[PDB]
């Protein structure tokens, strides 16, 4: 049994708002109409598409509630590039975190996969177009994102640079994924430009 679509696998897994449980393989349009509403890149896209073949049992679960961010703003992370019913929105399975009361404290969150299925976890980084944009969203001028599992180590830095406008935005979002094994934990640390997981996916092959 196959899965056919008019979206991208990226936009479907991220929860692109413009896009509305078992399969052998996935076949997608070469140029889907709904890919990344906010422009950017999805890392190791083909490896992920190949991994999502012959999957059995696929269920989205909430791993980091949007309501658990007490000292950052989880409600401001929307964009006119990602409209839903004529109002600005954003990918629904990750959270674009914003400073709160002109402050962006350092985030230190971990999530231990206490299920018995593999979890596909997605996160991202925001590359603003200029230094003034970086102040307005995150306050801290010089920022990082640190990600760690038992198999993975990321120490990222956003590139503040003006790009050509795509869907109105001259900045960019870049997304990453990993398979978190049962009883391993993913550790995040950031003082800005962090697109945090909210929903993850149980994977059985």
């Amino acid at each position, epitope marked *: 049994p196959l899965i056919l679509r008019d979206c991208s696998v990226a936009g479907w897994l991220l929860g692109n708002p413009m896009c509305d449980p078992e399969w052998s393989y996935i076949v997608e349009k070469a140029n889907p109409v709904n890919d990344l509403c906010y422009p950017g890149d999805f890392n190791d896209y083909e490896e992920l598409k190949h991994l999502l073949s012959r999957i059995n049992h696929f269920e989205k679960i909430q791993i980091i509630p949007k309501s658990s961010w007490s000292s950052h703003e989880a409600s401001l992370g929307v964009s006119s590039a990602c409209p839903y019913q004529r109002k600005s929105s954003f990918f629904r399975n990750v959270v*674009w975190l914003i400073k709160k009361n002109s402050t962006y404290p350092t985030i230190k969150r971990s999530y231990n996969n206490t299920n018995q299925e593999d979890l596909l976890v997605l996160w991202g980084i925001h590359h603003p177009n200029d230094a003034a944009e970086q102040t307005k969203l995150y306050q801290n001028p010089t920022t990082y994102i640190s990600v760690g599992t038992s198999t993975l180590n990321q120490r990222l830095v956003p590139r503040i640079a003006t790009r050509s406008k795509v869907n109105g935005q001259s900045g960019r979002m870049e997304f990453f994924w990993t398979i978190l094994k049962p009883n391993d934990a993913i550790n995040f640390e950031s003082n800005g430009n962090f697109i945090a997981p909210e929903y993850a996916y149980k994977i059985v092959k």
Partner: antibody, heavy 125, light 110 residues
Framework: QVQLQESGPGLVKPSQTLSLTCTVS??????????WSWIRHHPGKGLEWIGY???????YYNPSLESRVTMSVDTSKNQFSLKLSSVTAADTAIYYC?????????????????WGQGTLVTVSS | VLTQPPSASGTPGQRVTISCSGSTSNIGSNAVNWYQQLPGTAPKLLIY???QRPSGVPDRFSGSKSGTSASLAISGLQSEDEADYYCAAWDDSLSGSWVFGGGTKLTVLG
């Protein structure tokens, strides 16, 4: 129908601080993703945006006024407010509060709606 | 900051257009709004997102933008449309703010 009401008209002496408050009724200042804005009309000129503020505290100001401007929110009184320091006769204006209703980005909100009835502040010795 | 003709006029039933000239940093990069100020009242929103009307604003008011210029077209002109019309846009200069045109006083003749 959310409604906004500025505090009463008054005189401020040059170099003192102008303080105004907007009372919101018919809805919670902390409900929704709105920015709460101040806009003024200097007599015989146009409209000048002063800035706006989110209910949890972050604010954005017009760069020509930034150093003299501070706004704040009082969610318990359902109010937000404006302080403009070191005033001169150039700050004599009708001061309007308004709700920036439509978010286009985390800090860019458009569609000022509704507005208060303005309040006239005269700067004079 | 944005440039508007100080006056405009038309006779009832006509179509009148009000222009707004900006720069790359404001109209060229950002959504345009229009506000109507009737005599004795506060401004009210007429157009947001370049060409969208709020509830209660009829089709006769039409907003448009191209390049660094924006335009408001008022069809089926009525005597009650006498007002000052203001364009507005976010300006990217100096870390950003809303800016307004100087306003256009529209008179309906006859």
């Amino acid at each position: 129908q959310v409604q906004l009401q500025e505090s009463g008209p008054g005189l401020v002496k040059p170099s003192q601080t102008l303080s105004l408050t907007c009372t919101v009724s018919g809805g919670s200042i902390s409900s929704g993703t709105y920015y709460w804005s101040w806009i003024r009309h200097h007599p015989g000129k146009g409209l000048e945006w002063i800035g706006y503020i989110y209910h949890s505290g972050s604010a954005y100001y017009n760069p020509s006024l930034e150093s003299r401007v501070t706004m704040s929110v009082d969610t318990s009184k359902n109010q937000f407010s404006l302080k403009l320091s070191s005033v001169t006769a150039a700050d004599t204006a009708i001061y309007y509060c308004a709700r920036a209703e439509n978010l286009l980005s985390p800090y860019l909100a458009e569609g000022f709606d509704p507005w208060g009835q303005g309040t006239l502040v005269t700067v004079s010795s | 900051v944005l440039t508007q003709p100080p006056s405009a006029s038309g006779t009832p039933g006509q179509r009148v257009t009000i222009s707004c000239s900006g720069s790359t940093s404001n109209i060229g990069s950002n959504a345009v709004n229009w506000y109507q100020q009737l005599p004795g009242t506060a401004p009210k929103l007429l157009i947001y997102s370049n060409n969208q009307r709020p509830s209660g604003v009829p089709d006769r008011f039409s907003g448009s933008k191209s390049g660094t210029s924006a335009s408001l077209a008022i069809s089926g002109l009525q005597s009650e449309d006498e007002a000052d019309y203001y364009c507005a846009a976010w300006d990217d200069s100096l870390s950003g703010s809303w800016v307004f045109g100087g306003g256009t006083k529209l008179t309906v003749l006859g």
